[PDB]
Design a protein around this ligand. Structure first.
Ligand SMILES: NS(=O)(=O)c1ccc(-n2cc(CNC(=S)Nc3ccc(-c4c5ccc(=O)cc-5oc5cc(O)ccc45)c(C(=O)O)c3)nn2)cc1
Ligand SMILES: [Zn+2]
Length: 257
């Protein structure tokens, strides 16, 4: 039903998902001058050494690299978080042009794409329960800008031809998500939501200040994916991003001065 077209895009979502106009919606613009340094915020703990990737899926909205989340194998802790959050999947949002594609913006700047590493709070037992809680998920967001290639992204780029259309999946074992991280773990954080329907207000957002660089050839391959299923009219999977939503009664905190 919902998507990113003129007739089913972000401006329409509220009709089926009234929380779209809620009090803690994502993404948002990060006004860097208004964000306040919070000296009490802990360093982020990204522990991905035991990660078990399984599969890559074109779900018609993006592609997800899925992980075994039946044990503490790849976890996010520290920062603004209380407890342990398990990595379940990552995906990206990207544009049709290098000048757009990110969901979060920084002083109104749009990046070419944005990576979301999605984690759920163990305390809640599984992902489905976690999305029903205001602190159920932690999403680590990383901006992508076009420049030098990201070597750790290439394995993802090269499998995309095998999942061109909605509903296609491929084996995707032994992928190391540490190869997608920038050098610095400096971040902004705020309480928000899923950025796609059902738009549930269950996410602690942690957005890294340092973007990663990917090559023009790498993002061009993202843009060859299809929203449609096999044997349907081709619609390129591009501009699968929700624009910035009102900040309302929220403060964005910075881990760094
Ligand atoms: N871009 S992003 O922000 O990083 C992002 C965006 C979307 C997802 N995403 C979206 C999905 C789709 N799967 C979902 S939403 N699962 C799910 C799980 C539980 C419920 C749910 C219930 C499920 C079963 C049930 O018996 C009762 C339920 O009661 C609820 C009450 C709530 O307040 C909220 C959610 C539920 C629902 C849902 O119905 O929305 C959907 N999976 N991952 C992940 C990350
Ligand atoms: Zn996302």
């Amino acid at each position: 039903h919902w998507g990113y077209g003129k007739h089913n895009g972000p401006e329409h979502w509220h009709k089926d998902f009234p929380i779209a106009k809620g009090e803690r919606q994502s993404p948002v613009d990060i006004d860097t001058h208004t964000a306040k340094y919070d000296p009490s915020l802990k360093p982020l703990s990204v522990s991905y050494d035991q990660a078990t990737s399984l599969r890559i899926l074109n779900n018609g909205h993006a592609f997800n690299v899925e992980f075994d989340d039946s044990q503490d194998k790849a976890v996010l802790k520290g920062g603004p978080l209380d407890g342990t959050y398990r990595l379940i999947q990552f995906h990206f949002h990207w544009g049709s042009l290098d000048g757009q594609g990110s969901e979060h913006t920084v002083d109104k700047k749009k990046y070419a794409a944005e990576l979301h590493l999605v984690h759920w709070n163990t305390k809640y037992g599984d992902f489905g329960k976690a999305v029903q809680q205001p602190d159920g998920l932690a999403v680590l967001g990383i901006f992508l800008k076009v420049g030098s290639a990201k070597p750790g992204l290439q394995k993802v780029v090269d499998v995309l031809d095998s999942i061109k259309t909605k509903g296609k999946s491929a084996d995707f074992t032994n992928f190391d998500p540490r190869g997608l991280l920038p050098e610095s773990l400096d971040y902004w954080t705020y309480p928000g939501s899923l950025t796609t329907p059902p738009l549930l207000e269950c996410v602690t957002w942690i957005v890294l200040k340092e973007p990663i660089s990917v090559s023009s050839e790498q993002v061009l391959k993202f843009r060859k994916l299809n929203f449609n299923g096999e044997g349907e009219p081709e619609e390129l999977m591009v501009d699968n991003w929700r624009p910035a939503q009102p900040l309302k009664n929220r403060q964005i905190k910075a881990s760094f001065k």
